[PDB]
Amino acid sequence: SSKVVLSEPRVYAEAQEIADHLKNRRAVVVNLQRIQHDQAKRIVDFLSKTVYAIGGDIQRIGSDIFLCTPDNVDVSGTISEL
Amino acid sequence: SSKVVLSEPRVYAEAQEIADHLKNRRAVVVNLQRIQHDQAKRIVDFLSKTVYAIGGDIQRIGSDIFLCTPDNVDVSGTISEL
Description:
Two copies of one chain form a homodimer. Chain A is of the alpha+beta class. The first copy, chain A, has one domain (1-82): SepF-like protein (Translation Initiation Factor IF3, 2-Layer Sandwich). The first copy, chain A, is 35% helix and 33% strand. The first copy, chain A, has two helices and five strands. The radius of gyration of chain A is 12 Å and the shape is globular. Chains A and B meet through strand 1, strand 2, strand 4 and strand 5 of A and strand 1, strand 2, strand 4 and strand 5 of B. Strand 5 (73-77) of chain A pairs parallel with strand 1 of chain B. Chains A, B: Cell division protein that is part of the divisome complex and is recruited early to the Z-ring. Probably stimulates Z-ring formation, perhaps through the cross-linking of FtsZ protofilaments. Its function overlaps with FtsA. Chains A, B: One of its GO terms (molecular function) is identical protein binding. Chains A, B: It comes from Bacillus subtilis (strain 168). Chains A, B: This is Cell division protein SepF.
């Protein structure tokens, strides 16, 4: 009844395919561990633009890992930074 | 139409409240960064028992972070270890 996609981009264009899942109403977990730190910030800025346009959300859930959601997925609870 | 709960347990009993969300058909992201390493393994064993009993799944999505799902949530894609 709902889908979660796991993503571990190795190039920027792979992180750009994440937008498609979100447009098809799927939550995506994105692990940026393979991306250099400055490029990872750029990916997060790109995904932030993407989820905002569609009424979604994006949030960091751990070191180098983000949860991106479309508007049909509600996120609750809190994970604080270390 | 679907819910994801974020959880950052500081004691073992908090990780035990995760079972309730799963029984109520909610995916849970669990960040174990506040738990010592041996106790974190114990929590994962506990949650593994819990999701198995209800037809759910559990999988590591990053360092100290796990995605626990009930049977109504389908997980796709792959995140490899570093």
